[PDB]
Amino acid sequence: FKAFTGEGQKLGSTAPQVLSTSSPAQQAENEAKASSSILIDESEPTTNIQIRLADGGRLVQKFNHSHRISDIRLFIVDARPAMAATSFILMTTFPNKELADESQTLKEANLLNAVIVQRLT
Amino acid sequence: RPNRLIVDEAINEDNSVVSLSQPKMDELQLFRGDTVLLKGKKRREAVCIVLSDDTCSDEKIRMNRVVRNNLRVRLGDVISIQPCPDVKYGKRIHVLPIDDTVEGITGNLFEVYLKPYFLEAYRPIRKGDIFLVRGGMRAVEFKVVETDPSPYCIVAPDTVIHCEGEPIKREDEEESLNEVGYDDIGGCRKQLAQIKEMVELPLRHPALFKAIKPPRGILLYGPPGTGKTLIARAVANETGAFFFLINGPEIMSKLAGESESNLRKAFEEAEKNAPAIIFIDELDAIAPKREKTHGEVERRIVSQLLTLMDGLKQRAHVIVMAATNRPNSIDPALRRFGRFDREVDIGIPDATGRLEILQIHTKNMKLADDVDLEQVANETHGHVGADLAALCSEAALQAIRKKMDLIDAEVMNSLAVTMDDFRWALSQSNPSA
């Protein structure tokens, strides 16, 4: 009853993962820079949204409500410039509704929580 | 302790969602869509995802049947929940089917059931978990034997899934999901809640009644086929109470003395398995009206039933329930205080009830986009749960017979029932009430 036998063809298509963005310590430094670049309103409450990446995320980041999804879309690229050349799409989970519109604020999108997972675009 | 929560039924039918109250979510610092490592009774661990629910008490945690069984936990128990951010995208995940449900079913159990269920949803998974996948008008179970990150894992579009066939046998500790559950009954939600409030505490916390009266007789009545037996079976299953079915015709078939002995031994056995539930099906068949009975042996058996039921008083934690059509259907002195002192009216399911029953019976069925159960449920006047099940089965049969003109699980899942099939079955409904 060996559990390592045979094979099953791939579930999906090829995923172009490179992770050529330097040692994760550099990623953390750039994430800190981007976080400091986030303008905290000081009035509306603050929430930490953690993000999952294909290779692995866990990128916890505090945020506000007045911002737009464009804010996170830009912050992710700042912390991961390699994503600048690689278009990214963010979707919630259960339902896995794709988050398309960016002009809507986080309050408008009522997404103040960790349903931020990255998929290839 | 904040992590301690009382299990409760889940409205969300998804197999991997745990509903919690928003106050409790924020108090626990749990963000919807995050993984959680539930701790069961016998060191059982279930990895699921938390979701907010306004209609949920803070201590109450709503769960699906599958997760409950995976944790070997029943409603009203206490479970520990904590975030488990340490989840990796496992690559090698080995899942196997269960023989008792895939027998006579051919075609690779992938691209048919496993593939659509997983796809890209990122369903969390733990080693040894059991989950149910619906398709091809059948509910196939699967056991997660191994995962690349031992033991917790989450499927990913880059995860490699191995399904090497060879269905595994069901171990006795595990309780098959084919058994009736609280979600298998629709329409009589009010009566079902009444039954919970009536019988849950004696069975779940017997020590309280032995120390600190309890209801001993519940008379379920209504048109035949309304699922009364279904109700009793479900109740027994969630409360973990021994179930003993005493079919009225079975007793009446036995000759004089043999029938009374059988009834007596059934009660004694049920008593020896306390806590237990005795379902006296078709009670009118055993104890009809005084005018209807015209035989010494029947009056003797009725007297014997009354004497045994009275003897139940010195016994305890044994609940006897029976099925009939109307209280006046059975002879008097059976509704006297004590014996069958409580009554419940299942009645006929309403439009919402019929919709719920149809959904329950069509879970495995693949219906076309044009098929809408609400419109038909509105049309289906005076149908009993048995009638609704038969109607759905007839529509399925119509679709299958139509396709035969042109078993492989792929072919089975390929065909889908259409609204025309439902309309045709409707024309052949033959209502019973």
Residue numbers in the entry:
A (entry chain B): 250 to 370
B (entry chain A): 22 to 233, 236 to 429, 437 to 463
Provide the authors' own sentences about this structure as they appear in the paper.
The AAA+ ATPase valosin-containing protein (VCP)/p97, known as cdc48 in Saccharomyces cerevisiae, is an essential and highly conserved protein involved in numerous cellular functions, such as regulating protein homeostasis, endolysosomal trafficking, membrane remodeling, chromatin regulation, autophagy, Golgi formation, and others. Its core function is to unfold ubiquitylated proteins in an ATP dependent fashion. Previous studies have established that post-mitotic Golgi reassembly requires presence of VCP, as well as two adapter proteins, VCPIP138, and p4734,35. VCPIP1, also known as VCIP135, is part of the ovarian tumor protease (OTU) family of DUBs, an essential family of enzymes that remove ubiquitin tags from proteins to regulate protein homeostasis and function.
We find that there is clear density for three UBX domains, with two bound to N-domains in the up-position and one bound with N-domain in the down-conformation (see “Methods”). Although the UBX domains from VCPIP1 and p47 share structural homology, the p47 UBX domain has an additional helix (aa 273−286), which allowed us to assign all three visible UBX domains as originating from p47. Using AlphaFold354 predictions of VCP N and D1 domain bound to p47, we were able to fit in the highest ranked predicted model into our density (see “Methods”). Compared to the VCPIP1 UBX domain, the p47 UBX domain binds to a partially overlapping area of the VCP N-domain. It also uses a phenylalanine, F343, to occupy a hydrophobic pocket within the N-domain defined by VCP’s V38, A142, Y143, and R144. Additional interactions are mediated by V364 and V366 of p47 UBX domain that engage with F42 and Y143 of the VCP N-domain, respectively. The extra helix of the p47 UBX domain is connected to a short loop (aa 244−272) which is connected to the SEP domain (aa 180−243) through a long linker that includes the SHP box (aa 253−261), a motif previously reported as critical for VCP binding. The SHP box acts a secondary binding site for p47 UBX domain as it has residues that interact with the top of the VCP N-domain, unlike VCPIP1 UBX domain. Specifically, L260 of p47 further stabilizes P178 and L182 on the VCP N-domain, G255 and E256 interact with H183 on VCP and F253 SHP approaches R113 and E167. Lastly, there are additional contacts through A252 right next to the SHP motif, which interacts with E167 on VCP.
